[PDB]
């Protein structure tokens, strides 16, 4: 049972669609953590309260080295605060802006830590449904951590996520409002793997309608530098039919993954 007075607040860490996440330290400990702030009026006006409940219940009951930790929460008259584990190395979005592209070793390592975290989620029938570079955080030893369980749910489901957000990481069945399962996170894993190596997602366009067309028709091409081992993995993950998508153990055991991942 914490309160705002139990914390010393520092600089902002990142911007959220419902308030910023700030760097903070607990007075009696000097322990460094992140405080996600959400404004009540915005939650109420949007009708996000039920999804915020799912975010807090699901995330707090997960324990994995590649998943961000949710310690607890508290609220006042105008805001809701989420006590998060601090990720010292920032996002994989920022790391991708610095390094225009990632090499095969970085990608295979990140995809390995990502598949390991998703298997733990999928073992509890939990699906993230919002895997994008801004929600992938780098912990103390440079390891990946899955954050923002804002759209996480228990499989199966049909709930609409982005009304007009980034469609780039969403599978065809999600953008079309169809029934979806664990296979949605496998599509996001392929888009992520393509983006890590190329610099941009495979269905990127300057119009929501063109992106919709390109993802529903699976219209993408690989630039010259993409290796046959990466081309195979990406093409296996990015299939229209969710049943034709591989299992997480086949991604972890893929020849191109095992040849470039850091044990
Ligand atoms: N634990 C954390 N450590 C460091 N930065 C974080 C942490 N949690 C969030 N951030 C930063 O805050 C941004 C928004 O946080 P996020 O939880 O994704 O909120 P929203 O769901 O509102 O988008 C992230 O993209 C990242 O830059
Ligand atoms: O008490 C209030 O006035 C209020 C107002 C609001 O808009 C949202 C919430 C709220 C939602 C989820 C939550 O986390 C959960 F309880 F689900 F874990 C904790 C507080 C509380
Ligand atoms: Mg986010
Ligand atoms: Mg969110």
Specify the 3-state DSSP secondary structure of 12.
strand
Q: In CATH, what number is assigned to the domain containing residue 65?
A: 3.30.200.20
Q: Does 263 reside within a domain? A: no
Which of 38, 43, 78 gets mutated to test ligand 2 (max ligand atoms within 8 A of its CB)? 43
For residue 75, tell me if it sits in a domain. yes
Query: Domain check: are 173 and 104 in the same one?
Result: yes
Q: Which residue has the tokens 């999804």?
A: 51
Residues 14 and 112 in one domain: no
CA-closest residue to ligand 2 atom 15: 53
Number of domains in the chain: 2
State the Cα–Cα distance between residues 132 and 100, nearest whole angstrom: 16
Residue numbering of the annotated binding site for ATP = 17, 36, 85-87, 134-135, 148
Q: Tell me which long-range contacts 57-64 makes (C-beta under 8 A, separation of at least 24).
A: 58/126, 58/149, 58/152, 58/153, 58/154, 59/149, 59/152, 62/120, 62/121, 62/124, 62/126, 62/149, 64/116, 64/117, 64/120
- Domain of residue 98: give its range: 92-258
């Amino acid at each position: 049972q914490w309160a705002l007075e139990d914390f010393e607040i520092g600089r902002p860490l990142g911007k959220g669609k419902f308030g910023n996440v700030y760097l903070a330290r607990e007075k009696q400990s000097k322990f460094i953590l992140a405080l996600k702030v959400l404004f009540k009026a915005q939650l109420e006006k949007a009708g996000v309260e039920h999804q915020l409940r799912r975010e807090v219940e699901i995330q707090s009951h997960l324990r994995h080295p590649n998943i961000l930790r949710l310690y607890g929460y508290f609220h006042d008259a105008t805001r809701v605060y989420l006590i998060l584990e601090y990720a010292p190395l920032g996002t994989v979005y920022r790391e991708l802006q610095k390094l225009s592209k990632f090499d095969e070793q970085r990608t295979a390592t990140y995809i390995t830590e990502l598949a390991n975290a998703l298997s733990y989620c999928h073992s509890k029938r939990v699906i993230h449904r919002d895997i994008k570079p801004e929600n992938l955080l780098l912990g103390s030893a440079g390891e990946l951590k899955i954050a923002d369980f804002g759209w996480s749910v228990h499989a199966p489901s049909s709930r609409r996520t982005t009304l007009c957000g980034t469609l780039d990481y969403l599978p065809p069945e999600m953008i079309e409002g169809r029934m979806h399962d664990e296979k949605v996170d496998l599509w996001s894993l392929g888009v992520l793997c393509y983006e890590f190596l190329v610099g941009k997602p495979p269905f990127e366009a300057n119009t929501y309608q063109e992106t919709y067309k390109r993802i529903s028709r699976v219209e993408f091409t690989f630039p010259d530098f993409v290796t046959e081992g990466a081309r195979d993995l990406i093409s296996r993950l990015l299939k229209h039919n969710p049943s034709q998508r591989p299992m997480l153990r086949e991604v972890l055991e893929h020849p191109w993954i095992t040849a470039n991942s850091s044990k």
